[PDB]
Design a protein around this ligand. Structure first.
Ligand SMILES: [Cl-]
Ligand SMILES: [Cl-]
Ligand SMILES: [Cl-]
Ligand SMILES: [Cl-]
Ligand SMILES: [Cl-]
Ligand SMILES: [Cl-]
Ligand SMILES: [Cl-]
Ligand SMILES: [Zn+2]
Ligand SMILES: [Zn+2]
Ligand SMILES: [Zn+2]
Ligand SMILES: [Zn+2]
Ligand SMILES: [Zn+2]
Ligand SMILES: [Zn+2]
Ligand SMILES: [Zn+2]
Ligand SMILES: [Zn+2]
Ligand SMILES: [Zn+2]
Ligand SMILES: [Zn+2]
Lengths: 18, 144, 144, 18
């Protein structure tokens, strides 16, 4: 789904930036 | 009256307009520069996915500026807040703004920018303040 | 269509009406019983504080059902979600519902209950689901 | 303020219930 699969790219960017 | 709201709207609306048209304080300047670098990166890396997303939303709604705000609310609905989420939602906002201008060159990005700013500032105010606001945003993403 | 929304509204509206009037599924039953025990406790322990709060809000607004929802949004604006917050906000809702009935015995608690339910379910949906919904609520507060 | 001083009673209930 759109929600979870924005929330994939956001958390898994957040965790590039620790 | 709301300093944080106005500051946030300034940054977000400027980014969305730059992105949509393709043409261009000190704290705001740094924030915008960070948003450009990281946001352009999100859009580059996730262009295919973003294209897939906007269509689905269009089938269900579009026309309503509020489509994006609800997506934002759902992203945050697990109770987690971080800068990766904030910048990813702003970046998707810019992708949507580009699309709207492509359909109609006189489309205005302001309602979209206000929608995004409303969710972040009104619903995440104390988080933003604790994290040092836009200064913290810049410091979170700065590498060298 | 929204099972969680309807379930939540059932529980919250029933509690607010019971509290406001003073007179009275299985998952809903347990939830309501837990809400009674813990919520009545919050109201007992914090009656003085609650009285202080409602007046201030009345000076600024009242009349608008949305006064409570904004208080809820501000509570959650640091990005933290827990059952203590959820039950405390519902309890304050019941305190406000009691007040509204005291002024006007034909006041309806439903708009208040919907306002509370809208914030919890729409803005905290995935948290609620992860925490096992109203079942988790019951299990969080059960002692013996 | 009303916000922080609901958020006192809520977190400091939450942390009675661990
Ligand atoms: Cl969604
Ligand atoms: Cl002014
Ligand atoms: Cl510092
Ligand atoms: Cl039906
Ligand atoms: Cl909201
Ligand atoms: Cl389980
Ligand atoms: Cl407040
Ligand atoms: Zn990415
Ligand atoms: Zn300014
Ligand atoms: Zn389109
Ligand atoms: Zn406009
Ligand atoms: Zn606050
Ligand atoms: Zn039912
Ligand atoms: Zn009154
Ligand atoms: Zn009614
Ligand atoms: Zn979700
Ligand atoms: Zn207490």
């Amino acid at each position: 789904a759109i929600x979870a699969x924005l929330r994939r790219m956001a958390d898994d960017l957040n965790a590039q930036y620790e | 009256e709301d300093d944080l709201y106005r500051q946030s709207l300034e940054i977000i609306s400027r980014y969305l307009r730059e992105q949509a048209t393709g043409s261009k304080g000190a704290a705001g300047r740094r924030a915008l520069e960070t948003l450009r670098r990281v946001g352009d990166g999100v859009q580059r890396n996730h262009e295919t996915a973003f294209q897939g997303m906007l269509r689905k939303l269009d089938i269900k709604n579009e026309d309503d500026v509020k489509s994006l705000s609800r997506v934002m609310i759902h992203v945050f609905s697990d109770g987690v807040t971080n800068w990766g989420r904030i910048v990813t939602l702003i970046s998707f906002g810019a992708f949507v703004a580009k699309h709207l201008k492509t359909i109609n060159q006189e489309s205005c990005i302001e309602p979209l920018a206000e929608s995004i700013t409303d969710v972040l500032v009104r619903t995440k105010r104390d988080w933003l303040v604790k994290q040092r606001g836009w200064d913290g945003f810049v410091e979170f993403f700065h590498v060298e």
